[PDB]
């Protein structure tokens, strides 16, 4: 019980250190890189318009949240293509070029394979470096070309809002979980641009124009999305952050630039930041129990408000899927905290129910031939932590319930996922090591908890028959 609480705390640090887990160091390798974009190059303008049409059909959510007007995008595109035809520079045109490139790449990542494979040209495969493996390879080749272009034009430029959009367009991708130091540095730059431009001044004023309203709305959406990622990608490799400039929605009793919420607006980015703030106040700040009671009330209320939204089209399904996923995940974390630190009754089964809920949701979204929508990396992080804890309390404690749930999650994630190869492979391998630890502990200051103490010590220092027990330690 108290031993249990201690090893639960150790699991907390172990999941942090789990989760804080090629690029050429020098841009001139990509100096003479051809394209993916030109008229003869790869992707055939007519097809590219279709890609954008697919994007607006399915994935409005992101950039619909950011920008003001969106017929702008085909307008700018056709202008760009006409100008490129006439040419056979400036700030605005280069920026919009990068915007369309990024938007495209997001759309590639959330396309199906067969579609793009039919779309793409032929002979340039012979020119270039070379199923889903072709998709993710050509995606990567596209991304690194984009990143060459953008790094150069990032630094040598004035500050404009559009750079932020690029990064936010790209963040919903494997990017940050494949190129993380880069992502942290560019994130710091984007934070500096945020506090430059006064985009905290979405604070709406009297008798402004509708255009002005839309501008402030865009800033508002940007702000809260950025607070989301700045929390979510806040490993100790980064220390600068912006999520402190918002405030918790919790209404604590125990306590100018600092924003308060509930005084502004209700666009669902608000709701996502509220959920993430509840996660924040769970993790880093004062854990109570009355606090958790209030959080649980508030979050059930918010899931009601979520499910009030109705089924009409792909984007709406996607958004409400993502929110309900978030809410059940956070409830699971809360109830984990309860059942671990204080052990109030029935919480294990009441915790198991949301997990079943999540797994039914993703199975449904597979069955509808929307597997591509599943691959938002937040979902992957969720399944990662779930499999971790379920493995942990499966090896320490017995429940065919938990075995079944863990087996569903691991067989799911194993059989399916190409793209996130390094993360998943590291996770599955060290997970298998923990399965060997199951066989060990089946074969109380235990040596196994001492081994995990050694593992956290190894990881913290990696930031910068006990003979046989050490032998299996060598073995794994």
């Amino acid at each position: 019980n108290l031993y249990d609480k201690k090893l639960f705390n150790i699991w907390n640090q172990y999941e942090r250190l789990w989760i804080h887990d090629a690029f050429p160091l020098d841009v001139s390798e990509y100096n003479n890189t051809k394209d993916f974009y030109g008229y003869e190059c790869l992707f055939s303008k007519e097809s590219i318009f279709k890609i954008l049409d697919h994007s607006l059909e399915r994935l409005g959510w992101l950039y619909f949240g950011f920008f003001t007007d969106i017929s702008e995008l085909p307008y700018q595109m056709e202008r760009y293509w006409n100008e490129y035809e006439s040419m056979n520079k400036s700030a605005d045109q280069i920026l919009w070029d990068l915007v369309l490139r990024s938007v495209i790449v997001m759309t590639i990542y959330y396309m199906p394979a067969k579609s793009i494979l039919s779309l793409v040209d032929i002979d340039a495969i012979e020119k270039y470096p070379l199923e889903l493996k072709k998709k993710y390879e050509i995606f990567d080749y596209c991304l690194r070309h984009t990143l060459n272009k953008v790094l150069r034009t990032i630094f040598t430029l004035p500050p404009d809002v559009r750079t932020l959009q690029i990064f936010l367009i790209l963040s919903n991708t494997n990017f940050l979980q494949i190129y993380p130091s880069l992502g942290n540095n560019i994130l710091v730059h984007c934070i500096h641009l945020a506090k430059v431009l006064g985009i905290k001044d979405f604070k709406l004023k009297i008798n402004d124009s509708g255009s002005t309203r839309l501008q402030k709305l865009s800033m508002h959406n940007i702000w809260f999305r950025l607070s989301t990622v700045d929390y979510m990608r806040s490993s100790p490799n980064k220390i600068i952050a912006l999520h402190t400039d918002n405030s918790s929605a919790l209404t604590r009793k125990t306590l100018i630039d600092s924003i308060d919420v509930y005084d502004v607006e209700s666009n669902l980015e608000v709701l996502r930041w509220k959920i993430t703030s509840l996660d924040r106040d769970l993790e880093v700040s004062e854990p109570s129990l009355k606090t958790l009671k209030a959080m649980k009330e508030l979050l059930g209320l918010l899931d009601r408000k979520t499910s009030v939204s109705n089924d009409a089209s792909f984007n709406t399904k996607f958004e409400s899927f993502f929110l309900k996923l978030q809410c059940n995940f956070v409830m699971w974390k809360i109830l984990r905290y309860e059942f671990m630190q204080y052990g109030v009754t029935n919480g294990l089964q009441k915790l198991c129910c949301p997990a079943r809920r999540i797994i039914a949701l993703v199975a449904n979204f597979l069955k509808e031939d929307y597997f591509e929508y599943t691959t938002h990396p937040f979902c992957v992080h969720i399944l990662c932590v779930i499999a971790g804890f379920f493995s942990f309390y499966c090896i320490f404690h017995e429940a065919d319930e938990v075995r079944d749930l863990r087996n569903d999650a691991v067989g799911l994630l194993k059989l399916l996922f190409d793209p996130l190869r390094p993360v998943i492979s590291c996770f599955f391998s060290n997970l298998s090591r923990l399965e060997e630890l199951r066989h060990i502990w089946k074969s109380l200051v235990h040596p196994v908890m001492y081994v995990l103490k050694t593992d956290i010590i190894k990881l913290k220092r990696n930031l910068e028959s006990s003979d046989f027990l050490e032998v299996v330690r060598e073995f794994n």
Partner: protein
């Protein structure tokens, strides 16, 4: 029985003790401390020149028992367990000064809450003792007030004076994020309620009066949490010009909206109206009412907040002119 009661989790015992607002008592005070000590007010006291820790009712603080620091700190984990204080006819100056000097000398000064349950005169040595003494009393954010005479003669800063030891140091007025007050008849009837000096406040509590108007109330930044409990009829903000702004072009079910982007006249009017509405409630995001039985002032509100639990009324339901934006 006893151990059968104690073989049980915390929530069941919590609700049991809530209904009952000694090992019984030790678990009672564990869990009441664990969640919230709204039930029992718990502070320092001395008898015979010997200190103890006494535990009281909240309304007027009739004692139940007291116990020793070392007893309590063997019962629990010793710490700088943050705690309370309240001055009475029992607790005035020398006991207050004795506790001050002893907390300096024998011990340290861990205590936060201060209470003014008696001593409406601003006099008879309690204020005189304590106003010098706040400097080594530093964990706090929190205070209780009783009389409108004391509030008028201490707090409502329209009556500025030059009595330095009679009134606070204002570095303490920075460090008072919370507030509590009770026990008067007519706060806002033609009153001078204005509290801009009372800065770095973040939560107010009111209970047990007979009248109020909110137009008289003017406030600092940073304070949005309002707790208010059972009173008589209230004069809410008037909003009568803003009632006059309205048309029935849009009104549905106690809510309104312009969907038409084309109607920039009415859309802009809508946003003007909404922003006027929040400008009435500008430094505020949270209201709690127990049953106060009447509100007079033609309620029109935002829908963001009532869709959540911000505007948290009990069933003091003698009102009809309710509406949302």
């Amino acid at each position: 029985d006893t151990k059968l009661f104690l073989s049980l989790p915390i929530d069941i015992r919590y609700t049991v003790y809530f209904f009952l607002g000694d090992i019984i008592l030790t678990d009672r005070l564990r869990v009441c401390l664990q969640y919230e000590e709204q039930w029992f007010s718990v502070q320092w006291i001395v008898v015979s020149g010997e200190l103890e820790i006494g535990i009281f009712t909240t309304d007027e603080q009739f004692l139940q028992v007291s116990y020793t620091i070392n007893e309590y700190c063997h019962l629990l984990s010793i710490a700088q367990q943050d705690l309370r204080l309240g001055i009475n006819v029992s607790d005035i100056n020398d006991v207050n000064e004795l506790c001050k000097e002893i907390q300096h000398r024998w011990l340290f000064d861990t205590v936060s809450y201060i209470s003014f349950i008696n001593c409406w005169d601003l006099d008879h040595e309690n204020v005189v003792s304590i106003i010098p003494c706040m400097e080594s009393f530093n964990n706090l954010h929190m205070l209780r007030i009783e009389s409108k005479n004391m509030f008028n003669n201490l707090i409502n800063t329209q009556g500025v004076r030059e009595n330095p030891g009679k009134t606070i140091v204002y570095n303490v007025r920075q460090n008072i994020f919370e507030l509590e007050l009770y026990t008067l008849r007519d706060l806002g009837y033609k009153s001078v309620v204005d509290l801009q000096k009372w800065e770095q406040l973040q939560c107010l509590s009111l209970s047990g009066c007979e009248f109020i108007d909110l137009n008289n109330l003017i406030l600092p930044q940073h304070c949005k949490m309002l707790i208010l409990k059972e009173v008589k009829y209230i004069i809410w903000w008037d909003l009568s010009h803003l009632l006059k702004r309205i048309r029935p072009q849009w009104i549905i079910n106690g809510q309104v909206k312009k969907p038409t982007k084309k109607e920039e006249e009415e859309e802009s009017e809508w946003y003007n109206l909404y922003l006027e509405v929040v400008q009435t409630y500008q430094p505020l995001n949270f209201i709690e009412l127990h049953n106060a039985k009447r509100v007079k002032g033609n309620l029109i509100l935002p829908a963001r907040l009532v869709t959540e639990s911000r505007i948290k009324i009990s069933n003091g339901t003698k009102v009809d002119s309710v509406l949302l934006i």
